[PDB]
Ligand binder design. Structure first.
Ligand code: OO2
Ligand code: OO2
Ligand code: ZN
Ligand code: ZN
Ligand code: ZN
Ligand code: ZN
Lengths: 521, 524
């Protein structure tokens, strides 16, 4: 009846300090959630009360706040070491700053194993990266041993910068042999830890034989059994039980994201290394759990470098700038409208032809909301959380067919928190999700340029339009292969942050609204 | 067979200089229309060729451009005298600057009769206005005599400032006694000249017995027989023939407005003073009719005072700011949106406490939008450009309204739709849907309003029992344009800032503007 307590975080996304419950900057400290210093308290309490504890991360500690912008990963390595994480699987964002941006800050500093069984190194890189990351690590858990096989999304080269010499294999194909190797080493307790999303995690559990528990992330999935503690509605019960093809019940877990919740799963194992019981729930990390003084004091030492960013206010918002994934990836969100307006305003300030009236933007690219409760105030730090990436707002030229195609893509796999869903500037779209995928756009009206008075006219499949979009999309990011393939021109614009930072500095006081640009039938 | 040539203008609205064909400021002089110096050339050219000519004005020479803002009527009196107008009926706008603003500049200075048979002076006013205007004037036309009875819109006190000591009678009731009086003076040739609109003009012709011809204005009606010379689509043939209740065919005329066209109607009269033939058409004052050098030279003398306004640029528009009556009074117009956005932006720049002190709604009578702005001159926008759009001198006032009062105003907005009636509201942060098939007062099928009592503003269906904070012009607040329910059922009214200054500072802020027709107002 050997009991294992699995504690896990996924998609912390540079959320080192305690946050608001929407995961934005903390204002009212007493009503603030998350943090690393608050995580350390709960982890330590659990480690006291429980004999066999593992602390894991399913990737995406990289990218999100001014913490990563400045420390570029050093903060992940330093604080994950203080919290004494047992393992961490590689996420797509760990490659955002290139392989040198992963090797030097994280791989070379992390005093704990970093894992991925489907990333295959090629060329001279292989002998450089030797043992910096591993397909698995066999860990001593008291008087027993626990093997943990890692995995990273096949999609990392289309979401990040992992370079031309890392091969991203299919997870199931790359996992099953490593599991069988651990099996022939008599490792009876196998955990799959990785960054591919809940739907992938469900199949890893179903297909990869020998896996006792699947720990995941990427899809920012919140799972809960009972009455949730906050605003997150669960996708399913915690853990999610997958009846695998070999006849076992495989528990699948995820801890939402941004370090708001600490995943907690108690596992009963037999002498043979099989699951008998699998129960728990994610602990909401809040005010009712103090921040450890030593970690908090240390967090404050690292905050001196970051202080010289929030210094200047670029404007004030009288409304809540909803940049949440739960809004921006399912329907029209005021942060989308605000950004898309700033892009058009950027272009039309210095401009029938050369005039731009259209803007598209993948909702997943909107990485944080902004609270209006702090005197309306907006700083660089506030924006750096919304737009962390470092892209540009590029000018493209598209056929009515290519624009139709992208909008049909926008809602092809709708209701999955998929970031392909587009927020729009100077476009009026109407979707009918009852209809089969690819014929879900029932109306699409676009603002005209070849007109003295701009009005919305039905989109013409044979006309040519001049859209402002992020470079990520211009480059066929988010599956928009048709943009990169069928574009008739592409001129590269200005830095995403600077574009929106110019506009807020201009408007002085902003108030974007949900006015019906995107609609549903 | 005694022939009369009637030449007429109506609703010139301070358009002294030549204009663009949308009646906005002239840029490319060679492709510019109208003005007083072009008018003088064609008038003089007709007076030579024709023996019995009359030049008339059916009111509204007052209000419109920087000309009236500065000269306050003196420019009307000076230039109408130079053009040697035979008569002029009183329009509603002649009262915009009060009765002292009519007596001192126009009535005393005008070397020609000014008329209105339904305005009745009373008390201390009566005395200070004796013979300054008259119900009619009998005019010698060659070897014959022509009587002209004037008339002014019953709703001048709800459209202008004529004061409390002037009584606006029902036109037909006040007109007949004068026509029947003139008849007993053996005045066989009677013209009705007034400012009440085409639909009133049609009834004056129908009901007022003895009227031979009705000359009008107010409704900026363009009438034409054949292929029009410009962008104005005609309401009907010129002249419009009204088969009167006494058995006669009464020609009804109107010359559009802003001095763009000169009305021209040739009339054949018998020994008895009746119409036999009534034919003509409005002459478009275009590039092809030269400006008279003496009038143009004199116009230039008066332009020195006006020059120190257009001096500073307040911003640039990349789009055509359509402030036309043909757009702003029938459907959503980008000038309405621009203004309504500037009003909300004015308030919300100095606001926020919680869900109160906030405003997300704006209503604005389309008739209050008095001019468009052309983007063709380097995008550029001056004070003079704005002064034409917003000439009145009102303010953008803050009101508090029930869902029912707001519903009522929106049902009013389209009660008599398709008449170029200015009551039709342009909106800021409101999404309205009309179905004109439905009987009047139940034509609003959808009305969604932007919320304040929400952290994220979204459009929610209007609630008949909730209370909303709208920014609207003072004219509308004080229940102008028939919006009696606003004045009567308002739950609070705090007065804002000067209409021009509100929109100027927003243009000075935005630097480069581009308003659009984005579906705030819709139709089913
Ligand atoms: O935390 P995740 O694993 O990302 C979960 O969210 C998935 C969505 O995120 C969106 N997304 C992800 N990465 C990007 C990126 N990155 C580029 C800049 C730095 C590297 C490449 N640039 C942009 Cl505009 N968007 C990115 C994309 O819309 C995905 O659907
Ligand atoms: O203008 P006319 O040729 O006479 C015929 O058109 C009638 C429409 O015009 C609009 N309208 C007329 N007067 C006003 C005014 N005046 C106030 C300021 C000066 C005195 C009262 N203030 C305002 Cl916002 N609007 C005015 C109004 O929308 C009428 O329905
Ligand atoms: Zn993530
Ligand atoms: Zn991820
Ligand atoms: Zn007029
Ligand atoms: Zn009038």
């Amino acid at each position: 009846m050997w009991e294992l307590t699995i504690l896990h975080t996924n998609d912390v996304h540079s959320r080192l300090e305690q946050t608001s419950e929407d995961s934005s900057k903390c204002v009212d400290a007493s009503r603030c959630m998350g943090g690393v210093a608050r995580l350390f308290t709960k982890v330590q309490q659990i480690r006291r009360a429980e004999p066999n504890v593992l602390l894991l991360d399913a990737g995406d500690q990289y990218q999100g706040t001014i913490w990563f912008t400045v420390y570029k990963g050093a903060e992940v390595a330093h604080f994950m070491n203080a919290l004494r994480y047992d393992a961490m699987a590689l996420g797509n964002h760990e490659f955002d700053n290139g392989v040198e941006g992963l090797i030097e800050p994280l791989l070379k500093e992390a005093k704990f194993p970093i894992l991925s069984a489907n990333i295959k190194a090629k060329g001279p890189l292989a002998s450089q990266i030797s043992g910096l990351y591993l397909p698995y690590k066999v860990l001593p858990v008291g008087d027993e041993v626990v093997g943990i096989v890692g995995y990273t999304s096949k999609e990392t080269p289309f979401l990040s910068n992992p370079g031309t010499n890392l091969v991203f294999e299919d997870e199931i194909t790359a996992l099953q042999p490593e599991v069988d190797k651990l099996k022939t080493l008599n490792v009876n307790k196998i955990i799959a830890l990785g960054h591919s999303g809940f739907e992938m995690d469900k199949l890893i559990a179903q297909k990869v034989r020998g896996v006792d528990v699947v720990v995941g992330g990427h899809s920012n999935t919140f799972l809960y059994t009972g009455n949730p503690p906050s605003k997150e509605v669960p996708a399913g019960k915690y853990p999610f039980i997958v009846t695998s093809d070999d006849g076992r019940k495989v528990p699948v877990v995820q801890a939402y994201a941004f370090g708001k919740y600490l995943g907690y799963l108690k596992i009963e194992f037999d002498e043979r290394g099989n699951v008998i019981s699998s129960h728990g729930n994610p602990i909401l990390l809040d005010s009712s759990i103090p921040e450890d003084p030593s970690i908090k004091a240390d967090i404050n030492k690292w905050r001196i470098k970051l202080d010289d960013y929030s210094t200047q206010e670029l404007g004030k918002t009288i409304v809540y700038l909803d940049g949440s994934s739960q809004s921006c990836r399912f329907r029209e969100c005021n942060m989308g409208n605000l950004i898309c307006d700033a892009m058009i305003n950027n272009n039309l300030r210095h401009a029938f032809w050369n005039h731009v009236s259209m803007c598209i933007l993948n909702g997943g690219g909107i990485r944080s909301p902004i609270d209006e409760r702090n005197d309306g105030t907006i700083t660089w730090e506030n924006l750096a959380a919304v737009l962390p990436f470092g892209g540009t707002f590029d000018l493209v030229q598209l056929k009515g067919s290519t624009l139709k195609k992208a909008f049909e893509h926008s809602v092809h796999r709708y209701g999955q928190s998929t970031g392909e869903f587009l927020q729009v500037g100077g476009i009026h779209v109407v979707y009918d999700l009852s209809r089969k995928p690819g014929d879900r756009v029932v109306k699409l009206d676009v603002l005209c340029t070849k007109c003295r008075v701009p009005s919305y006219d039905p989109l013409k499949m044979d006309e040519v339009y001049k859209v402002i979009l992020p470079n990520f999309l211009a480059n066929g990011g988010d599956g928009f292969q048709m943009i990169k393939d069928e574009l008739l021109r592409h001129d590269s614009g200005d830095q995403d942050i600077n574009v929106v930072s110019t506009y807020i500095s201009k408007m002085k006081v902003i108030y974007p609204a949900v006015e019906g640009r995107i609609k549903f039938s």
